[PDB]
Amino acid sequence: PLNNIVVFGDSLSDNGNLYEYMKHQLPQSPPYFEGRFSNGPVWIERLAASYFPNDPNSHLLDYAFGGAGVSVDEEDDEVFFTLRREVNSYLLAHQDKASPDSLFVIWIGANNYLGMPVEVEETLKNVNRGIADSIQRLVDKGAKHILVLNLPDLGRTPAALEFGSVEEMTYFSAQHNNALSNTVDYFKKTYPEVEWLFFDTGSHFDHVIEHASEYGFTNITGTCSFSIVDEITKNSVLKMVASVKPELTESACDGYLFFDLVHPTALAHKIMAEKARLMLDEAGVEFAE
């Protein structure tokens, strides 16, 4: 049985790391929830708690930073931290060994595309390459269980709607997901001794959207919080978060899909966690201790 969860990711998975480094000044909390890029715990925390209800945090090593992504030189000031450095950080503290009883979780890419870079094909290429490289490294250092998550349709974000980039954000999402599936297929065949797990966020998010009211959402285009960004400032997820005006947050957001211009609300993180748990249960994954 697996003994803990190690997650590499970005603002969709960060459980407070950027907030601590920012001296609790970003994401401003309230209206964000204790440094998460949402108004509640994020999906991977809830997933950890579903297996370890008493002390989940002692079984969760969350290396995700808000603003993190795959190194793409064009986005140096737009990527806060790289996937490679998150993996290296884990390896540095574990004497360069990936534990065989950890579930490694990789959910990366959204921050790269939502920064709306100018070179579309090179960004797609380097994000895929960076993910493949980090997977290979984890395998090389001994990982035996790896969960890879693909992207929701970023063309559904309020950001894409406001800035007029729906087609481009959907293109990034779809092309990214196609490449990532080819990647996971490869590793499945090259390393059958590793337990390969995949979550098709793209398909699950589209199914939620199509049944939004049944999942509890009454508003899928607006934002709970309110931000004000221009072209220069709107170049990054973190600048969009720093531009939130807390006094203009809605008080009653229980029906919103989006908390800010790109980040989903607590309920969405809950649904994500529930569907991920069911997928892992279907695969027979067990945790203990």
Side-chain angles (χ1 to χ4, degrees), residues 1-77 79-84 86-230 236-289:
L2 309 184
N3 286 309
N4 44 68
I5 296 167
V6 181
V7 61
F8 303 119
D10 58 21
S11 57
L12 293 166
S13 295
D14 184 357
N15 65 342
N17 295 303
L18 187 62
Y19 185 70
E20 288 297 319
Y21 180 64
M22 291 289 181
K23 298 91 188 71
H24 291 196
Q25 293 184 339
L26 186 158
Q28 288 194 70
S29 302
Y32 292 85
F33 172 79
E34 303 187 358
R36 284 65 163 178
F37 293 80
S38 191
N39 61 339
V42 296
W43 74 287
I44 192 67
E45 311 187 67
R46 293 189 207 252
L47 182 63
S50 82
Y51 293 111
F52 301 100
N54 296 339
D55 186 9
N57 289 323
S58 75
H59 300 271
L60 176 61
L61 297 180
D62 188 329
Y63 292 90
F65 270 121
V70 173
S71 165
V72 166
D73 231 2
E74 185 222 293
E75 308 189 274
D76 280 327
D77 283 347
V79 167
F80 178 82
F81 205 73
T82 61
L83 174 61
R84 181 179 179 80
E86 293 183 19
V87 173
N88 289 350
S89 295
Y90 170 82
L91 289 173
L92 190 73
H94 293 84
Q95 284 299 97
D96 200 39
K97 301 183 87 203
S99 168
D101 61 353
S102 294
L103 176 63
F104 293 94
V105 180
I106 302 173
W107 196 14
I108 268 286
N111 194 83
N112 289 104
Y113 302 127
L114 287 168
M116 316 215 179
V118 315
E119 318 179 49
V120 18
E121 291 303 327
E122 202 72 4
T123 302
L124 282 168
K125 171 196 297 193
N126 286 338
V127 170
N128 185 262
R129 174 168 170 170
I131 293 172
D133 189 70
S134 271
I135 296 173
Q136 182 58 229
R137 285 189 69 211
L138 289 171
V139 175
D140 287 341
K141 299 300 177 175
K144 298 297 195 184
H145 314 269
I146 301 176
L147 172 60
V148 178
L149 297 85
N150 72 5
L151 294 178
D153 179 3
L154 300 174
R156 295 284 182 190
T157 59
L161 296 165
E162 151 168 359
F163 298 152
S165 57
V166 171
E167 184 283 332
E168 293 78 5
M169 290 305 106
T170 298
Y171 184 80
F172 276 135
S173 299
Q175 296 299 126
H176 173 91
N177 288 347
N178 177 68
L180 184 61
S181 176
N182 290 338
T183 296
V184 172
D185 279 354
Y186 170 91
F187 283 100
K188 279 186 204 202
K189 112 170 295 187
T190 306
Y191 297 109
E193 76 276 19
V194 175
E195 172 171 42
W196 298 100
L197 305 155
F198 191 77
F199 190 76
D200 188 352
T201 320
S203 299
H204 293 298
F205 183 91
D206 279 356
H207 184 263
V208 171
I209 283 273
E210 291 160 2
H211 300 271
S213 69
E214 299 174 283
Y215 283 96
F217 304 104
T218 58
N219 181 325
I220 66 186
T221 55
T223 56
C224 178
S225 74
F226 181 77
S227 56
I228 298 167
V229 245
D230 46 333
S236 90
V237 170
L238 291 185
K239 298 253 197 182
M240 291 184 270
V241 166
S243 79
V244 160
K245 313 303 172 180
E247 82 275 6
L248 302 183
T249 309
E250 297 301 301
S251 291
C253 297
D254 274 349
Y256 280 78
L257 178 52
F258 288 94
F259 182 74
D260 65 27
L261 282 174
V262 300
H263 294 119
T265 54
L267 176 55
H269 275 284
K270 183 178 175 71
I271 296 166
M272 179 83 192
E274 291 170 344
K275 294 188 175 287
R277 173 63 188 263
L278 291 170
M279 180 280 282
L280 294 164
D281 286 355
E282 184 195 345
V285 174
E286 291 212 324
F287 286 85
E289 277 267 306

